[PDB]
Ligand binder design. Structure first.
Ligand SMILES: O=C(O)CNC(=O)C(=O)O
Ligand SMILES: [Mn+2]
Length: 181
């Protein structure tokens, strides 16, 4: 597909990355597309990297993230060559311990981006992404449908607290070429 879904202005995501190292955007994509992505997530659960030509919903997600790639390059000069992503479905009780996405070891992943897909999430459900920001500040993100979180991979440690219900997301990374051919 060649359709490009509606999304809020990317300039704000880029300014946030520059100023704070991270950005969060509610309703990043229209609700019908987010639901279609939730559906594809469940379909795949029943690593499958996502590429154009696999499903309509995914094609539209990639088109938007490609726009975000070009916007990031423009504003922050990162030389990002591509975006890789895949679905993730955490069973109730699953958690992800504190970690950094990019090690100090040349890792090509420069910027992380997670799109959440869960309708009707409540705080009793847990499952927040917890981000460890500068100055010892912590920030929880509830994995609410349509919510996009973007951050610098080498900079923001983060974890996922266990949820009481299936937790759906689309997780990815913008990458540089890197020094190894
Ligand atoms: O799903 C989330 O919110 C967090 N995901 C990750 O930290 C990851 O896949 O590396
Ligand atoms: Mn991570």
């Amino acid at each position: 597909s060649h359709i490009s879904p509606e999304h809020p202005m990317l300039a704000a995501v880029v300014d946030d990355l520059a100023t704070h190292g991270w950005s969060q955007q509610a309703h990043f994509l229209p609700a019908d597309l987010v639901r279609a992505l939730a559906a594809e997530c469940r379909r795949r659960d029943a690593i499958q990297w996502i590429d154009p030509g696999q499903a309509e919903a995914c094609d539209q997600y990639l088109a938007a993230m490609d726009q975000l790639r070009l916007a990031i390059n423009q504003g922050l000069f990162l030389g990002l060559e591509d975006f890789e992503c895949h679905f993730a479905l955490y069973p109730p009780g699953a958690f992800y311990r504190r970690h950094l996405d990019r090690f100090r070891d040349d890792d090509r992943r420069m910027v992380s981006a997670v799109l959440y897909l869960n309708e009707g999430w409540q705080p009793h459900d847990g499952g927040q992404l917890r981000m460890f920001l500068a100055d010892g500040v912590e920030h929880d993100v509830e994995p609410v449908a349509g919510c996009l979180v973007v951050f610098l991979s080498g900079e923001v440690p983060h974890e996922v607290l266990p949820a009481g219900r299936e937790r759906l997301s689309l997780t990815g990374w913008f990458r540089r070429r890197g020094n190894d051919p």
